[PDB]
Amino acid sequence: GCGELVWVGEPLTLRTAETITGKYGVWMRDPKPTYPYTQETTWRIDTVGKDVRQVFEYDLISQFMQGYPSKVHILPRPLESTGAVVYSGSLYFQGAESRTVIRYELNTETVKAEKEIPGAGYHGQFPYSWGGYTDIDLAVDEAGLWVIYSTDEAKGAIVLSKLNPENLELEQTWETNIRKQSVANAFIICGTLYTVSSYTSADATVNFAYDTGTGISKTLTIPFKNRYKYSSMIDYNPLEKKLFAWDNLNMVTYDIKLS
Ligand SMILES: [Ca+2]
Ligand code: NA
């Protein structure tokens, strides 16, 4: 069932990167797995550097946690930052030094669609507060695929658009009043965008909400712990109903509760 976020659990570390290449990154599972993948399949991208192309794929959670990848994909174009997601068999990622979102079908290693996010800032215009070229952040929730960004028209306030997952068309767009550069990251649960106050503090909070169904913005004070003091990626997985994050080399997951 769906509801408002009311609680976040303690971060649990599932894997720790062993080199500086993985100081920041993105790891994820597919909330709508398709053959040959399952809900155990995990993908990991270590995103430090300027030619990020390697995507580590693990058939089993045990392999993700303790072993080597079962497959490495080499993306056909370098990827930007930590905002990518996997949805219904495709990796959705942002091309380096662009506002282009790319749909890369994992089982065939084929680019199926590319879309400029209209008006979106990129490459350090509207990052989250830590920087990292985090201008464009994809998200999956119970209703499918979204993108979080900003524009000059929005004066840097978070904008979110629902995306067609097949062709990347924008279906609907909402504008919040939350300065994107003022929050550490964001994610969407049940159609509500939530933000995190700090990427360094052990005593951060989920501090704002914007409900796309009602247009209402709220403040919140839900505790959120950055166990390792540098969270570069915070996303929601609607199948597991958990937050997935990357915090200073560590791939972590948080339980949640909804009303
Ligand atoms: Ca996010
Ligand atoms: Na994302």
Side-chain angles (χ1 to χ4, degrees):
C2 261
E4 190 168 295
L5 180 69
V6 299
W7 173 82
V8 178
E10 288 280 340
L12 177 68
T13 302
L14 305 167
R15 184 77 186 243
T16 305
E18 288 189 279
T19 78
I20 186 75
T21 313
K23 190 178 182 71
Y24 29 95
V26 60
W27 75 282
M28 64 274 267
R29 302 194 173 120
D30 191 340
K32 294 283 171 123
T34 59
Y35 174 88
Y37 312 115
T38 73
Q39 58 191 273
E40 281 209 33
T41 311
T42 312
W43 293 268
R44 167 182 161 178
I45 314 175
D46 295 3
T47 62
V48 174
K50 277 171 68 171
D51 193 28
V52 178
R53 294 182 184 250
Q54 283 193 312
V55 180
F56 305 134
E57 178 177 283
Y58 305 85
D59 295 325
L60 302 175
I61 293 175
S62 46
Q63 299 165 340
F64 169 66
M65 296 174 73
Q66 296 293 334
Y68 283 85
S70 49
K71 165 79 173 175
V72 179
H73 305 287
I74 305 302
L75 294 177
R77 171 183 196 162
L79 165 155
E80 182 113 324
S81 194
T82 62
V85 301
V86 174
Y87 179 74
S88 198
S90 281
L91 176 70
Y92 295 82
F93 73 97
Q94 175 192 4
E97 300 167 350
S98 82
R99 55 159 69 92
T100 304
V101 173
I102 299 104
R103 176 189 170 199
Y104 173 84
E105 180 175 55
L106 289 152
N107 183 47
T108 61
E109 301 191 321
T110 296
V111 173
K112 304 274 292 185
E114 304 198 0
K115 174 54 81 152
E116 321 295 318
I117 310 299
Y122 65 101
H123 211 62
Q125 293 183 248
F126 311 120
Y128 294 125
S129 54
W130 72 273
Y133 302 133
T134 49
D135 305 59
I136 297 178
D137 184 9
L138 292 143
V140 185
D141 86 335
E142 285 79 1
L145 185 64
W146 307 69
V147 62
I148 301 165
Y149 57 104
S150 193
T151 71
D152 281 334
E153 181 147 329
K155 297 206 171 165
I158 289 178
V159 179
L160 60 163
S161 298
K162 194 71 187 300
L163 286 184
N164 183 308
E166 300 218 59
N167 61 23
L168 295 179
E169 281 297 281
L170 280 64
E171 301 176 338
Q172 185 166 357
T173 298
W174 296 258
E175 185 178 317
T176 76
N177 295 319
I178 302 157
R179 179 174 170 66
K180 188 168 180 303
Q181 291 164 264
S182 80
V183 300
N185 214 294
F187 52 82
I188 296 165
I189 303 175
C190 300
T192 295
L193 182 121
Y194 296 90
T195 64
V196 173
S197 68
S198 168
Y199 57 92
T200 59
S201 178
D203 307 300
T205 56
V206 178
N207 62 336
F208 298 111
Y210 174 87
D211 188 331
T212 62
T214 67
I216 301 299
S217 296
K218 307 183 175 183
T219 69
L220 299 170
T221 63
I222 303 167
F224 181 93
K225 176 182 286 174
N226 300 287
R227 168 65 173 81
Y228 304 98
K229 308 191 244 162
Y230 202 74
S231 286
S232 58
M233 194 285 289
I234 313 174
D235 270 18
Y236 174 67
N237 182 303
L239 182 56
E240 300 199 8
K241 304 249 182 279
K242 295 182 168 199
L243 303 178
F244 286 33
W246 197 295
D247 181 1
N248 212 356
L249 298 160
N250 293 269
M251 291 145 262
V252 305
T253 188
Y254 302 76
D255 284 358
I256 64 160
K257 279 146 169 87
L258 309 182
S259 66

